[PDB]
Amino acid sequence: ASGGGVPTDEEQATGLEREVMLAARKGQDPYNILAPKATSGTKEDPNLVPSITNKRIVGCICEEDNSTVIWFWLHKGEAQRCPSCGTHYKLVPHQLAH
Amino acid sequence: FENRVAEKQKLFQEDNGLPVHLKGGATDNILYRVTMTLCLGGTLYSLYCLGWASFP
Amino acid sequence: MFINRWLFSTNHKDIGTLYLLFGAWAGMVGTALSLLIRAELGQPGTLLGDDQIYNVVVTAHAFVMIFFMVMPIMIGGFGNWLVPLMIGAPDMAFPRMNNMSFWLLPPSFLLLLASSMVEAGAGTGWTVYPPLAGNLAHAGASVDLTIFSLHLAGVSSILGAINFITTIINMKPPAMSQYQTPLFVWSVMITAVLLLLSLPVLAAGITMLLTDRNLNTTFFDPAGGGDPILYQHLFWFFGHPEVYILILPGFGMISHIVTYYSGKKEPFGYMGMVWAMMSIGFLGFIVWAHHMFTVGMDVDTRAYFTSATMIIAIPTGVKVFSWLATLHGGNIKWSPAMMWALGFIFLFTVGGLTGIVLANSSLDIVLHDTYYVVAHFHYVLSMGAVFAIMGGFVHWFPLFSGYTLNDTWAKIHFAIMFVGVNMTFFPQHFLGLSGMPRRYSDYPDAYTMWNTISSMGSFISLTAVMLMVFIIWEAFASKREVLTVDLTTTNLEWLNGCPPPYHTFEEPTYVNLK
Amino acid sequence: ASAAKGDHGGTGARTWRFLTFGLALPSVALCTLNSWLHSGHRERPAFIPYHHLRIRTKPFSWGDGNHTFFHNPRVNPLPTGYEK
Amino acid sequence: ASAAKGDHGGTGARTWRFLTFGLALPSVALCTLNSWLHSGHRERPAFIPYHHLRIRTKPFSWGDGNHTFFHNPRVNPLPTGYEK
Amino acid sequence: ITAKPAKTPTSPKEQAIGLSVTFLSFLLPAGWVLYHLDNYKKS
Amino acid sequence: MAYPMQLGFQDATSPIMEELLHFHDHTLMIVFLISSLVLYIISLMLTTKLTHTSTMDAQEVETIWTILPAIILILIALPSLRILYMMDEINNPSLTVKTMGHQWYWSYEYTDYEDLSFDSYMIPTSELKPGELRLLEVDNRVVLPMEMTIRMLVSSEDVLHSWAVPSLGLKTDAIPGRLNQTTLMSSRPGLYYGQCSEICGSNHSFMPIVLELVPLKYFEKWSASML
Amino acid sequence: MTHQTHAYHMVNPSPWPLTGALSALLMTSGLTMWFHFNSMTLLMIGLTTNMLTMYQWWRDVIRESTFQGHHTPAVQKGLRYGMILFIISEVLFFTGFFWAFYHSSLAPTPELGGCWPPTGIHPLNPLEVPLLNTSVLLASGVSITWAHHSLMEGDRKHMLQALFITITLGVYFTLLQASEYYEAPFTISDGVYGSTFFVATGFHGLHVIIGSTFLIVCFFRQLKFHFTSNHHFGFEAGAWYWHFVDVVWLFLYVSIYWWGS
Amino acid sequence: YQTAPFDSRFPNQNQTRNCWQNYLDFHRCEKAMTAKGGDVSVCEWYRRVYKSLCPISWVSTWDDRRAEGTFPGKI
Amino acid sequence: SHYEEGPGKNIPFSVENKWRLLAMMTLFFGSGFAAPFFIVRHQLLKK
Ligand code: HEA
Ligand code: HEA
Ligand SMILES: [Cu+2]
Ligand SMILES: [Cu+2]
Ligand SMILES: [Cu+2]
Ligand SMILES: [Mg+2]
Numbered sequence A: 001a002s003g004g005g006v007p008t009d010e011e012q013a014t015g016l017e018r019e020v021m022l023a024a025r026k027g028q029d030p031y032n033i034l035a036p037k038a039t040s041g042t043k044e045d046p047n048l049v050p051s052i053t054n055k056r057i058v059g060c061i062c063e064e065d066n067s068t069v070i071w072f073w074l075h076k077g078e079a080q081r082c083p084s085c086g087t088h089y090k091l092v093p094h095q096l097a098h
Numbered sequence B: 001f002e003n004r005v006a007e008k009q010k011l012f013q014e015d016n017g018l019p020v021h022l023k024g025g026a027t028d029n030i031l032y033r034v035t036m037t038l039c040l041g042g043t044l045y046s047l048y049c050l051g052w053a054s055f056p
Numbered sequence C: 001m002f003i004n005r006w007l008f009s010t011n012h013k014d015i016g017t018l019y020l021l022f023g024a025w026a027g028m029v030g031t032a033l034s035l036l037i038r039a040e041l042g043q044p045g046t047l048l049g050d051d052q053i054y055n056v057v058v059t060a061h062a063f064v065m066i067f068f069m070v071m072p073i074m075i076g077g078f079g080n081w082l083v084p085l086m087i088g089a090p091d092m093a094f095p096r097m098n099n100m101s102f103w104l105l106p107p108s109f110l111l112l113l114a115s116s117m118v119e120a121g122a123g124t125g126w127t128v129y130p131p132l133a134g135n136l137a138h139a140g141a142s143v144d145l146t147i148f149s150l151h152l153a154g155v156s157s158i159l160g161a162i163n164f165i166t167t168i169i170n171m172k173p174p175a176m177s178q179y180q181t182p183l184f185v186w187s188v189m190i191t192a193v194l195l196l197l198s199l200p201v202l203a204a205g206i207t208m209l210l211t212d213r214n215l216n217t218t219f220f221d222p223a224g225g226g227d228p229i230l231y232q233h234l235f236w237f238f239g240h241p242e243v244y245i246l247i248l249p250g251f252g253m254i255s256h257i258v259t260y261y262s263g264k265k266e267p268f269g270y271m272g273m274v275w276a277m278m279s280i281g282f283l284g285f286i287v288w289a290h291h292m293f294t295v296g297m298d299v300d301t302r303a304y305f306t307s308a309t310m311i312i313a314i315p316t317g318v319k320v321f322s323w324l325a326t327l328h329g330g331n332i333k334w335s336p337a338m339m340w341a342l343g344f345i346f347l348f349t350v351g352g353l354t355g356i357v358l359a360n361s362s363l364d365i366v367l368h369d370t371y372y373v374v375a376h377f378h379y380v381l382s383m384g385a386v387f388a389i390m391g392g393f394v395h396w397f398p399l400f401s402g403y404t405l406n407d408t409w410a411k412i413h414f415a416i417m418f419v420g421v422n423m424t425f426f427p428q429h430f431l432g433l434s435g436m437p438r439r440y441s442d443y444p445d446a447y448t449m450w451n452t453i454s455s456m457g458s459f460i461s462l463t464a465v466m467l468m469v470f471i472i473w474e475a476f477a478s479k480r481e482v483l484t485v486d487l488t489t490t491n492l493e494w495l496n497g498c499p500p501p502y503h504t505f506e507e508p509t510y511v512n513l514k
Numbered sequence D, E: 001a002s003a004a005k006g007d008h009g010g011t012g013a014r015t016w017r018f019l020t021f022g023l024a025l026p027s028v029a030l031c032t033l034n035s036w037l038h039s040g041h042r043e044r045p046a047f048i049p050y051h052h053l054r055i056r057t058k059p060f061s062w063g064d065g066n067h068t069f070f071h072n073p074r075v076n077p078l079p080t081g082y083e084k
Numbered sequence F: 001i002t003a004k005p006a007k008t009p010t011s012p013k014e015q016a017i018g019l020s021v022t023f024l025s026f027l028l029p030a031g032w033v034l035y036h037l038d039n040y041k042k043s
Numbered sequence G: 001m002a003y004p005m006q007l008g009f010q011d012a013t014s015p016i017m018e019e020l021l022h023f024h025d026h027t028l029m030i031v032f033l034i035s036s037l038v039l040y041i042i043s044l045m046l047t048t049k050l051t052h053t054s055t056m057d058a059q060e061v062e063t064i065w066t067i068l069p070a071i072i073l074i075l076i077a078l079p080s081l082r083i084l085y086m087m088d089e090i091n092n093p094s095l096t097v098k099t100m101g102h103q104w105y106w107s108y109e110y111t112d113y114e115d116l117s118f119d120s121y122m123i124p125t126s127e128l129k130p131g132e133l134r135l136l137e138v139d140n141r142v143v144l145p146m147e148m149t150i151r152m153l154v155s156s157e158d159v160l161h162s163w164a165v166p167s168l169g170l171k172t173d174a175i176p177g178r179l180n181q182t183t184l185m186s187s188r189p190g191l192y193y194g195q196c197s198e199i200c201g202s203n204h205s206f207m208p209i210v211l212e213l214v215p216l217k218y219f220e221k222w223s224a225s226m227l
Numbered sequence H: 001m002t003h004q005t006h007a008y009h010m011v012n013p014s015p016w017p018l019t020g021a022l023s024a025l026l027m028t029s030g031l032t033m034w035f036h037f038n039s040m041t042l043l044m045i046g047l048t049t050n051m052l053t054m055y056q057w058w059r060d061v062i063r064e065s066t067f068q069g070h071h072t073p074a075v076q077k078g079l080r081y082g083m084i085l086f087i088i089s090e091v092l093f094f095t096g097f098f099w100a101f102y103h104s105s106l107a108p109t110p111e112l113g114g115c116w117p118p119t120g121i122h123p124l125n126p127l128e129v130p131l132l133n134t135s136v137l138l139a140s141g142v143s144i145t146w147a148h149h150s151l152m153e154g155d156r157k158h159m160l161q162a163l164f165i166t167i168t169l170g171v172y173f174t175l176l177q178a179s180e181y182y183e184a185p186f187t188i189s190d191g192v193y194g195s196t197f198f199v200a201t202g203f204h205g206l207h208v209i210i211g212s213t214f215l216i217v218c219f220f221r222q223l224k225f226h227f228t229s230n231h232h233f234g235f236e237a238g239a240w241y242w243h244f245v246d247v248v249w250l251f252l253y254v255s256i257y258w259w260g261s
Numbered sequence I: 001y002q003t004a005p006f007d008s009r010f011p012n013q014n015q016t017r018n019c020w021q022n023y024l025d026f027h028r029c030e031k032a033m034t035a036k037g038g039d040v041s042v043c044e045w046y047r048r049v050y051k052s053l054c055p056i057s058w059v060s061t062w063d064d065r066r067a068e069g070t071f072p073g074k075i
Numbered sequence J: 001s002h003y004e005e006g007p008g009k010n011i012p013f014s015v016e017n018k019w020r021l022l023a024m025m026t027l028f029f030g031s032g033f034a035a036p037f038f039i040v041r042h043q044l045l046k047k
């Protein structure tokens, strides 16, 4: 065999595909493709919910194997808490906007 | 061969406020108006045939 | 602008709405046909003049209600509207394709209407079995038109079944497992799988009938060495998964409705409720032949089919008892939809129990093709699938529109249709045990009372469906905009307000990986 | 027949524990019931001295060398006829 | 028969280009030779008016409506007998 | 479910009208066809 | 036949039909049990101000409502399967009459010895004689010997039909190119009516079945007089 | 909101679903006109608007993927499921035809002569051209595989070379099958043997023509540099569908050509 | 002889073959005894049975087919 | 996207005048319910 010729993504991927491509290699995830990892959720260690606005819906799986997710709008301001388990969440400005 | 995919990329990413099926050019519109015309005419023709057929 | 929105859509909501409109209209057509059917039977003798018109009428009733009312509404309507909302998706996986699934329905309905216009129409029963369905006994374009109406209706569903499975599976919040999605979603994912597997077999079966009618094949013609019974296998192989495709989404809506109005955060035994639907879906593929107990099969196989058909009651049973467990200790809100939910729970019970009787091939010998089976299936379809459609509609109307319905008018409507449907179908159990056959436009004098009462009943329901149209009108006429919705923590479809904006979830929800 | 049970017949220890107790084991229970229901013990078949059966070209290396390993006297006739 | 060709019937564009020209294509050449060797044109079968053949319950939507789509006059008799 | 009061309330009289128009639109066209069935059956 | 304002099955004219009445009573008793239970539990659930909206433990009670329904199904399936094998049971018929559905009339054939065969049509209600049943009377009844195991063989010469006769507890579709067998055996003389139980076109509703059962002797003379 | 932060594609309103729905109305009712009023103008219009719709719809799909970069990872994983599911629905379509066949052959009616193949039928020799068609299809299965690996290794020329060989084998099978149809001593009208044979093998034949125009498309997109060594779903779908096509042929071959004859 | 007795080899509701088998069996026996003479003895049992079970029209169309030499069964 | 939003704006028919709606809903459902009836009249008027 032998030879070359086909473009690479690194060199041909455009649009949002390219955007999630690079962002991904910088380690960041601006397009919510992966699942946020929890923090202790204490009042001094709230889960920081990034947002491109001033309120974002939060789903809290209180206990590990729970089948019911508790949903609520988290707003810009003082850390709020899941109505069923306390657990603090604090909004944060969303970074990579392109 | 060529490999002018970037020329196309720019053309289709151009912010001309057009929907993708028109984004490509003038021929897109003629093709579009042709398809819509045959579908509409055809749908009318078929309706005429059903009427013609729904009587002994 | 109207075109771009309503004809060139790519919005799960605008499409779901388009379905409910088609569904409601087809619902009006099927109701009319169900009334011609009973007008003809409400008095000894013949009303319609000729029997072929009656059969054409009975056949169309079944197709319109099944393929153009129940299915569009439950899957295309509630399915597109609520699925993306309940799992937090921006839209369906294939927005453009989804639009085709809808637009295939109006042409499909045109073909079915056309068939009853040309020639003498298709008086074949909704099972369209040959030879009656062939080119001798039904020479002409009618059956062929009926066969094409189903080809289109089947492509539309197979297409959307692909959309819901990909959506429900590939577009959930990354931290959310399938054992975290709401039961309605599970109900439509499973229903979608049944469509993906059964609908292609019907499409093959009716293609074979079409070639037998126009291309000189003899798949079902003994002359060529064919077999009219082979068609019965292909059709019923699709035909049973179909009866379940019609009840599953209703199972889901009812689970949401009963939990919401008991003030519970979740339905009892969630995972058992998931096991139950999955079981019903699986068993529903190995029982088809109960639809053929008087056709000539080997007793041993007739024995297998009644046994297999019975095990289905077990899983179904855990759902009936789970819903009861969900009301247990609930703070019950006697709202219109809770009434529709309570009716379904009992009426569907009676009707499925009545179907356990028929599972018995020995006894089916004498119950088959009589009005006892017409009773069985109208309890589950007319008082099960329909009751779920009404409960779900009155429950989610404010979300779709942003306006509220008059709760008192809504309850009168329930009260009327409850009497109506029961008075129409109850007597029919008698008529069948006593021998009155199905597909008859007339009957021996003895059967006069029950058919007389039954038809009267059919007139009460009509009243209930006229009042309903009014109820929707006055809802839109008064303009009572929604202010506060209860229990939204656990009910995500209500979080973006009534009605949700054109684009919900442009920014995903946030769900932690504990 | 065929098969199609909604979804989830793949990936996740939970999913596999689900199928184990929700499909797999319930099946074994049914089949076990069926097997225990048609446990109708057959009558020992009539004995006819057919030449292509009860073959014996060399005595078995155990017992009287005329008795097969899992010899069940009730259904297995010796070359000459049933045990008793 | 069976099969087992030493190794390498997996992974590598080179390996697959190897199988393409070293197994795949040579096979098609053999089978093509075999097919061209037994290209013995059968004699048109005797025509007997059997009732389960040459079926015709509705004329075909083309031609004289008595001629099948890929009608080959030399081996396909009409209902009444061979074309000529 | 709480809601703002009606933007354009529908007084009883208005409802009576709408309930009447709705009913007739269902009953008249069918009544006509059914009332004449015998004529059709007479050719 | 059926009488005005009937609720259940027509009276059993043969032994399997009696057998089915009892099974159906058994089965019906059970559906009455279950459906009244599900209605009691519902009103129970809806009749208290007491609340317990917190999470409840499932499964524990889930075994009861899963094993119990399974025991019941066995209690129906057994009796049911018995009667089924009993229906497809080895009997030895002393006669073999054939019947063939036709688009809007049945024709019977008794060809065991002679070659007897006749059509059978519904009597236009216009021409019924006082006392005759409106859509049930046929011109030529199918005469058969009472108290005897007959073997019926149903088929059709066109579309599908279904030969049925409730009182005896028989129903066998009529399928072209097929010969379906069924065993008839009345234990009482009389007239027994039935109707086509498979949509077959315009007059699916107008092609009944009437069985006239008389003692052998009258059967033989009838048969001969019939040709 | 306004700007999206999910990796999903929100497709612009497209007039294609309508134009394709209307397309099916024209084709079906057009087939009814042909079958009964022996006219083809309606069916011809339907087939035309149909090709026009499939052309532009897939055209846009390329526009959005290749040119506008909308097919992120999240999006492709969904296109994967869709194709798998679509293929499955097609397996069940061919399943009714093998059902039809076995129902017919495992129990031949006396009208056939109470046997299989029925008296009067002279089946083809499975060792003749049916074997040739089997080897042609199987070969294309290995050549299409070589093409996929070349693609992943960025070998532009060899991918074009393997795809070309593959395409010509599908055309070869199509021509061979066409001649077999013409030379066969039986027809669709020769009872259930002809019925069962020509519609099962017929539909598969139509599937080879649809699988070959799919690969022809993949061929040109490649000439035009659309695929990268890593994002090339259209070719994977093209290859999945092509393998579905051999498998159906092996089942046809062993069942109808070998066993059933 | 009253009517065809039970035949273990056709024990199910579908008897189409029972008719068919006996109609072949008969005509084949008949043809043999003819092309053998054998004091022109005859195989009546099959004709009695197939006569009982087969619908007349089957028997007629079959005989016709045998006449024109288009009977698909082998005798 | 210039698509209006909110109550009464997410549907394909105007809901501004309750009487014009009364008339649209009437032609809509009304025509559906009448279709079967006139299809029968049609079959009864053919030969
Ligand atoms: C879901 C399916 C469905 C539904 C609901 C119904 C509803 C009705 N059907 Fe049935 N029917 C069938 C499916 C259905 N039917 C089938 C499959 C057959 C067999 C055909 C055959 O034998 O071939 C049949 C046969 C059949 C017969 C037997 C004829 C014969 O065999 O001789 C009869 C007669 O009484 C009958 C009666 C009725 C009546 C009185 C209604 C009434 O209950 C109608 C009451 C009104 C409704 C319950 C619908 C109103 C709901 C809506 C319109 C939705 C509104 C929209 C929104 C809220 C968004 N039907
Ligand atoms: C909504 C769809 C629907 C549903 C859900 C069902 C569900 C069932 N149906 Fe139904 N059926 C129809 C619609 C439906 N059917 C239709 C349309 C036909 C007619 C088709 C035609 O020919 O036109 C038909 C025909 C039909 C026949 C054939 C009649 C004949 O032609 O001879 C059979 C026979 O077995 C049958 C059985 C059943 C059974 C076992 C159930 C079971 O799924 C029901 C299960 C429910 C329960 C049993 C109740 C809940 C459980 C408990 C409370 C636990 C305790 C129970 C016990 C101990 C038994 N149905
Ligand atoms: Cu079923
Ligand atoms: Cu009939
Ligand atoms: Cu009939
Ligand atoms: Mg039937």
Ligand code: NA
Binding pocket: C040, C041, C042, C043, C044, C045, C046, C047, C441, C442, C443
């Ligand atoms: Na009547």
Ligand SMILES: [Zn+2]
Binding pocket: A060, A061, A062, A070, A082, A083, A084, A085, A086, A087
């Ligand atoms: Zn929480």
